[PDB]
Amino acid sequence: RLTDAGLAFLKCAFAAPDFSVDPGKGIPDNFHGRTLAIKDCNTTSVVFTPNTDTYIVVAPVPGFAYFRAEVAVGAQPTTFVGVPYPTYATNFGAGSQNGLPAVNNYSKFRYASMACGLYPTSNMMQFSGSVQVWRVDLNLSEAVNPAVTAITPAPGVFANFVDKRINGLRGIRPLAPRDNYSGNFIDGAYTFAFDKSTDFEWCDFVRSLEFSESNVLGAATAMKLLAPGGGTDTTLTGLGNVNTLVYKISTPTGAVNTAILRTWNCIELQPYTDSALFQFSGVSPPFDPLALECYHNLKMRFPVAVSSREN
Amino acid sequence: NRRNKARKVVSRSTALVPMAPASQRTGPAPRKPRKRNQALVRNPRLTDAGLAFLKCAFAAPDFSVDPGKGIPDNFHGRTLAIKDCNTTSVVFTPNTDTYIVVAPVPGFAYFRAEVAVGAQPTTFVGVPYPTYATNFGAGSQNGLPAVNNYSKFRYASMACGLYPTSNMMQFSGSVQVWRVDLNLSEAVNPAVTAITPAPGVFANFVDKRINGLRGIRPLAPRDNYSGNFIDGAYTFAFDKSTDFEWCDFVRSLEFSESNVLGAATAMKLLAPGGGTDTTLTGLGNVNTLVYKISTPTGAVNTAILRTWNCIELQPYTDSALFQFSGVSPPFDPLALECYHNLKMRFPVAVSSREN
Amino acid sequence: NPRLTDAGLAFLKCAFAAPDFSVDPGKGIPDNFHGRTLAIKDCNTTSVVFTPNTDTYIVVAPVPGFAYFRAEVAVGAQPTTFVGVPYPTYATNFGAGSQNGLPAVNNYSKFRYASMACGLYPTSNMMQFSGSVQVWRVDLNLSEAVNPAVTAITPAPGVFANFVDKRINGLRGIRPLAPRDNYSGNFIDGAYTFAFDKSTDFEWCDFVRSLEFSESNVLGAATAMKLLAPGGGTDTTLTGLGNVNTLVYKISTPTGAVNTAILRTWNCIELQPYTDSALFQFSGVSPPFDPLALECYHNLKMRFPVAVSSREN
Amino acid sequence: SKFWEGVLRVLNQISGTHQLTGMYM
Amino acid sequence: SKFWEGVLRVLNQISGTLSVI
Amino acid sequence: SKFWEGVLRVLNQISGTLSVI
RNA sequence: UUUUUUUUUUUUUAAAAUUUUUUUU
Ligand SMILES: [Ca+2]
């Protein structure tokens, strides 16, 4: 009773790791338009510092695999630095202009799916610690503050402009919230993120070096998502419609913890007419209200996360 | 007689105009129309929460306990639903036109402005709910990401009721109600990028404003309710986005027509006490309720003011409030359809003291 | 199960076949908004001349108050600045004077495009026309960039904070070398096409008053591609960007040719009105919900040629 | 419950399954 | 002949997606 | 792996729930 | 000599959802 794309849509959304070739085709709603479904997916290895609580945050920031922060066991993380997808450059441009309208190959985006799997690679005798997963509803926000309009006459003329911020980061702490998955590190963990807008709402780009609690660059005590290398080559592109995944790994002293980290995500984007990528664009899938209703129903029926021995 | 052939597009005079190249495309074309056998049948049943959603929306004051539970759409996610009502006693200054503006700014019960009878109001100052701090933080940081307890919000309902408390001889005047579609907006203006070399370097940044305020004046628009002060007035606000759109927070001291702080001539919604403890949080998806009370000289006009609102919010997972979060109402398309249909079938307002 | 409602049918006619009736049938989007709206149903019909030996770009983007944006460039060259041509009704809708477009003088607080189309009608004779009309759609969307600005001028070089500035994505696709999807006909054949919803579901848009919508936050940047309000925004400024895609018309004219035509720009806009404007007397409740019409609309939009000869309207 | 009673009343004047088309999506 | 005629053509091949009882 | 199976399983369980018969 | 739309055939080649065997560490 589900359309072809509708079923593929569900597969991509919840069971990304189960398939050899990704079935995803995009969101089967009434969009029915020119889209290019970017399927970002890579695999790396992470090594956890002994005697630290490490945080791997998978947020819907186009072009970024995840954000990391390491802190003393029990301490409060503040800055999560992004690890970009090797594909960033091709999608959003490079150089000092990276991410801006001049080099960006898209004008709008929305996440059809996003998931992550942590596959421990330590031996059963040397590792030690835990894995904890949970989701936070990260959303961009604004604050209106004064800025100088004219430097004359001192101390200057002002007006109120808007600065960008991000809400939700404070929920990333050592104390896991009610809805979470807590397990032995060696068992790994897998989970998917899901739509937190009501209809897979389209998002506009907002190019920035950081998405923080403060509008003051580098603020040491402001919690924030930060583009690496001062945004010289890769900057934050925006924040999607799905919630954010939080992976907390506690590694005691002397523990030897390593894992393979695999992330997936399907993003529908409105393509610039002139890029090499446009060639691979096409029509959004046909309307399948059932698949949509099913997705929104299903998203609530699974454990917050599951061990990696059953992704 | 061919399949994947390019489509030609008729030349005016086929003899006077050289032939143009037939049109081609990128990616496959849309699939052939779906057959009528793919019959998806629907059962028109109103869900329990959908019914509660309707009560909370329109008949806010008619039950033993607020029935609201949230919007029964496909959001089906983790939310924190605020079901509250600010009930307070007020007095209207003799010989003035008082404006009680109920706008969807999380944390605020309403905005007030007093003016000479017949005059034009300009600045409406907010009166916050005592729960403001609990929800959006305290101190100078109030309202910001660091102290806010939510990351997104949307209004499921909002209503206001004015209950006169004067006797039949001491009062005098009128009550008038109407709704305005208040929406935030932006303006791009230059700001200093570098102070060197004078007069400095500039770039265009965006500043926030608010459209719709000009509609708050002594002259009531076509769609309104006008009555004797002593009869009070009640009404609900309703969704002006198309689908109960989710809203992001925009923390500001004022939402005005100008980006210049305190501009005397600029109409605006202003946070009280210079935003020391309570700042404007953002603007919701429902329209704004405007109550205009005209109190002549010598008149003793007192009343209880009730402000209701039901807000669905995406919570921070660390607040002490998180223990009350749960999954939002299950999808009820019938209820949603009913709501959007019903919202247009009632008088702009009704007397409160007749019910 | 059912069939189209009257308004739903009108909605469809207005959307795709704008020039086909006695009186514009449009009434707005028949979804669940079911509220108070002022619906603009208008068409800017004007005579134009394409400068010999130039590539002329007529960009029809969803910026309330503007009929289109024009750019003239050497044949083959890259256009960068498209200057807006406003509807005579601009002042009436968005205000006049230095304040034009701002909350104080604007008569609306929100908008969404129910339809938008463009038709180029050649008026040259069979011995004087020469050149082509290439048409294609682009997805123009506003965007943001967070950059630092001076918070305090003391102590030098000053104190900074990061603020947002507005930009626009998509313009780069407007160039001399069109995509394979483009419709390329002879100038004398004219061209007609409609734009369509590229938002989730006919999303409502807020106003963003600006002099330009460019790739750069620096005013007048020579290399930045941009949509520019005419006359320095003295009387008419950019009001915002709608939910439908943008229509691109590239007209190539050689030296010696005389390419003239009448240009028609249509648009149907649903707007939330200020209750005090002199226009409010025309506001009423938007069309009743017609799910069938909506499904049809979204289905059909992707099913017609990018453009067709103008003598096929 | 005078206002709700009114809502119920109107709720019936539009109950047809103009009228409500159960097909909300 | 007008675009509408063409729209109508396709508009009729379209069936719909929902039905109530 | 077996996550899709789980989805399929839950899919059956919520079958009678949907707003569509 | 042209433009759309509408089907049937097969060889196809795919993608998807279901039933059975026969090999292989
Ligand atoms: Ca929406």
mmCIF file of N, CA and C in Angstrom, chain B residues 168-217:
data_model
loop_
_atom_site.group_PDB
_atom_site.id
_atom_site.type_symbol
_atom_site.label_atom_id
_atom_site.label_comp_id
_atom_site.label_asym_id
_atom_site.label_seq_id
_atom_site.Cartn_x
_atom_site.Cartn_y
_atom_site.Cartn_z
ATOM 1 N N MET B 168 -23.068 49.591 38.161
ATOM 2 C CA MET B 168 -23.745 50.196 37.021
ATOM 3 C C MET B 168 -23.853 51.704 36.978
ATOM 4 N N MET B 169 -23.395 52.377 38.024
ATOM 5 C CA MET B 169 -23.470 53.827 38.042
ATOM 6 C C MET B 169 -22.100 54.494 38.004
ATOM 7 N N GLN B 170 -21.112 53.877 38.640
ATOM 8 C CA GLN B 170 -19.773 54.446 38.700
ATOM 9 C C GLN B 170 -18.925 54.397 37.434
ATOM 10 N N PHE B 171 -19.213 53.458 36.549
ATOM 11 C CA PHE B 171 -18.437 53.326 35.322
ATOM 12 C C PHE B 171 -19.032 54.171 34.206
ATOM 13 N N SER B 172 -18.388 54.078 33.049
ATOM 14 C CA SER B 172 -18.832 54.723 31.824
ATOM 15 C C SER B 172 -17.807 54.486 30.736
ATOM 16 N N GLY B 173 -18.274 54.381 29.500
ATOM 17 C CA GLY B 173 -17.340 54.152 28.423
ATOM 18 C C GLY B 173 -17.619 52.938 27.566
ATOM 19 N N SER B 174 -16.590 52.518 26.835
ATOM 20 C CA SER B 174 -16.707 51.408 25.913
ATOM 21 C C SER B 174 -15.550 50.424 25.888
ATOM 22 N N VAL B 175 -15.815 49.292 25.242
ATOM 23 C CA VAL B 175 -14.837 48.238 25.026
ATOM 24 C C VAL B 175 -14.942 47.950 23.554
ATOM 25 N N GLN B 176 -13.804 47.746 22.924
ATOM 26 C CA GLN B 176 -13.810 47.438 21.521
ATOM 27 C C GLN B 176 -12.716 46.434 21.302
ATOM 28 N N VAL B 177 -13.000 45.454 20.459
ATOM 29 C CA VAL B 177 -12.034 44.415 20.188
ATOM 30 C C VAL B 177 -11.932 44.172 18.704
ATOM 31 N N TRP B 178 -10.727 43.835 18.269
ATOM 32 C CA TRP B 178 -10.472 43.492 16.882
ATOM 33 C C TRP B 178 -9.108 42.818 16.829
ATOM 34 N N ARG B 179 -8.801 42.150 15.725
ATOM 35 C CA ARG B 179 -7.526 41.457 15.616
ATOM 36 C C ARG B 179 -6.638 42.053 14.542
ATOM 37 N N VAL B 180 -5.337 42.020 14.783
ATOM 38 C CA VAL B 180 -4.390 42.531 13.810
ATOM 39 C C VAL B 180 -3.392 41.411 13.550
ATOM 40 N N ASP B 181 -2.908 41.321 12.318
ATOM 41 C CA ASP B 181 -1.955 40.279 11.970
ATOM 42 C C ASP B 181 -0.545 40.809 12.178
ATOM 43 N N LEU B 182 -0.047 40.674 13.400
ATOM 44 C CA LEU B 182 1.292 41.131 13.717
ATOM 45 C C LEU B 182 2.298 40.091 13.267
ATOM 46 N N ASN B 183 3.277 40.525 12.487
ATOM 47 C CA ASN B 183 4.316 39.638 11.986
ATOM 48 C C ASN B 183 5.642 40.362 12.097
ATOM 49 N N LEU B 184 6.693 39.624 12.427
ATOM 50 C CA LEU B 184 8.012 40.224 12.517
ATOM 51 C C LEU B 184 8.444 40.469 11.084
ATOM 52 N N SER B 185 9.431 41.329 10.909
ATOM 53 C CA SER B 185 9.930 41.624 9.582
ATOM 54 C C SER B 185 11.366 42.092 9.721
ATOM 55 N N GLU B 186 12.014 42.357 8.597
ATOM 56 C CA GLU B 186 13.392 42.798 8.631
ATOM 57 C C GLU B 186 13.652 43.951 7.683
ATOM 58 N N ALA B 187 14.765 44.633 7.924
ATOM 59 C CA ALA B 187 15.202 45.744 7.097
ATOM 60 C C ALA B 187 16.712 45.597 7.033
ATOM 61 N N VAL B 188 17.283 45.806 5.856
ATOM 62 C CA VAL B 188 18.725 45.692 5.702
ATOM 63 C C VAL B 188 19.288 47.097 5.717
ATOM 64 N N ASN B 189 20.210 47.348 6.639
ATOM 65 C CA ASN B 189 20.818 48.663 6.785
ATOM 66 C C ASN B 189 22.307 48.556 7.043
ATOM 67 N N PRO B 190 23.053 49.638 6.778
ATOM 68 C CA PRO B 190 24.500 49.613 6.993
ATOM 69 C C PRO B 190 24.910 49.759 8.451
ATOM 70 N N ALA B 191 26.052 49.168 8.779
ATOM 71 C CA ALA B 191 26.610 49.223 10.122
ATOM 72 C C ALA B 191 28.124 49.274 9.945
ATOM 73 N N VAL B 192 28.825 49.817 10.934
ATOM 74 C CA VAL B 192 30.272 49.928 10.836
ATOM 75 C C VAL B 192 31.020 48.605 10.987
ATOM 76 N N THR B 193 31.860 48.339 9.997
ATOM 77 C CA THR B 193 32.664 47.132 9.917
ATOM 78 C C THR B 193 34.059 47.367 10.492
ATOM 79 N N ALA B 194 34.569 48.573 10.264
ATOM 80 C CA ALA B 194 35.880 48.998 10.740
ATOM 81 C C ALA B 194 35.794 50.506 10.948
ATOM 82 N N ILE B 195 36.445 51.008 11.997
ATOM 83 C CA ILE B 195 36.424 52.441 12.291
ATOM 84 C C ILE B 195 37.533 53.194 11.550
ATOM 85 N N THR B 196 38.292 52.455 10.750
ATOM 86 C CA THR B 196 39.404 52.996 9.985
ATOM 87 C C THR B 196 39.319 52.544 8.536
ATOM 88 N N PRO B 197 39.462 53.480 7.589
ATOM 89 C CA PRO B 197 39.692 54.910 7.808
ATOM 90 C C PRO B 197 38.375 55.665 7.883
ATOM 91 N N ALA B 198 38.311 56.690 8.728
ATOM 92 C CA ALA B 198 37.089 57.478 8.868
ATOM 93 C C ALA B 198 36.523 57.839 7.490
ATOM 94 N N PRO B 199 35.185 57.947 7.374
ATOM 95 C CA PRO B 199 34.192 57.756 8.440
ATOM 96 C C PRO B 199 33.933 56.285 8.780
ATOM 97 N N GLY B 200 34.865 55.417 8.390
ATOM 98 C CA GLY B 200 34.728 54.000 8.674
ATOM 99 C C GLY B 200 34.269 53.160 7.498
ATOM 100 N N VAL B 201 34.333 51.846 7.678
ATOM 101 C CA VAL B 201 33.919 50.900 6.654
ATOM 102 C C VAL B 201 32.554 50.315 7.016
ATOM 103 N N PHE B 202 31.692 50.175 6.015
ATOM 104 C CA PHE B 202 30.353 49.656 6.243
ATOM 105 C C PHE B 202 29.998 48.401 5.457
ATOM 106 N N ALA B 203 28.915 47.773 5.894
ATOM 107 C CA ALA B 203 28.369 46.575 5.281
ATOM 108 C C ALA B 203 26.909 46.610 5.692
ATOM 109 N N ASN B 204 26.061 45.905 4.956
ATOM 110 C CA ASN B 204 24.649 45.895 5.279
ATOM 111 C C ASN B 204 24.276 44.684 6.103
ATOM 112 N N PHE B 205 23.686 44.944 7.262
ATOM 113 C CA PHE B 205 23.261 43.895 8.164
ATOM 114 C C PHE B 205 21.752 43.980 8.301
ATOM 115 N N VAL B 206 21.141 42.946 8.860
ATOM 116 C CA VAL B 206 19.697 42.979 9.008
ATOM 117 C C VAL B 206 19.282 43.353 10.416
ATOM 118 N N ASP B 207 18.221 44.140 10.499
ATOM 119 C CA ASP B 207 17.683 44.533 11.781
ATOM 120 C C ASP B 207 16.233 44.050 11.791
ATOM 121 N N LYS B 208 15.685 43.824 12.979
ATOM 122 C CA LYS B 208 14.319 43.338 13.099
ATOM 123 C C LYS B 208 13.294 44.440 13.333
ATOM 124 N N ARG B 209 12.099 44.241 12.788
ATOM 125 C CA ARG B 209 11.004 45.186 12.948
ATOM 126 C C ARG B 209 9.737 44.370 13.116
ATOM 127 N N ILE B 210 8.603 45.051 13.127
ATOM 128 C CA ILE B 210 7.337 44.371 13.275
ATOM 129 C C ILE B 210 6.274 45.118 12.484
ATOM 130 N N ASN B 211 5.548 44.377 11.651
ATOM 131 C CA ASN B 211 4.504 44.965 10.834
ATOM 132 C C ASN B 211 3.136 44.706 11.431
ATOM 133 N N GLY B 212 2.230 45.662 11.237
ATOM 134 C CA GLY B 212 0.877 45.515 11.732
ATOM 135 C C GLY B 212 0.422 46.460 12.823
ATOM 136 N N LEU B 213 1.357 46.971 13.621
ATOM 137 C CA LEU B 213 1.023 47.869 14.730
ATOM 138 C C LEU B 213 0.189 49.095 14.377
ATOM 139 N N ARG B 214 0.441 49.676 13.211
ATOM 140 C CA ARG B 214 -0.302 50.858 12.795
ATOM 141 C C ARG B 214 -1.816 50.663 12.858
ATOM 142 N N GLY B 215 -2.249 49.406 12.841
ATOM 143 C CA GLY B 215 -3.667 49.093 12.892
ATOM 144 C C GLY B 215 -4.273 49.288 14.269
ATOM 145 N N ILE B 216 -3.423 49.527 15.265
ATOM 146 C CA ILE B 216 -3.904 49.771 16.622
ATOM 147 C C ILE B 216 -4.074 51.283 16.763
ATOM 148 N N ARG B 217 -5.314 51.730 16.609
ATOM 149 C CA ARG B 217 -5.652 53.139 16.667
ATOM 150 C C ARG B 217 -7.042 53.281 17.252
#
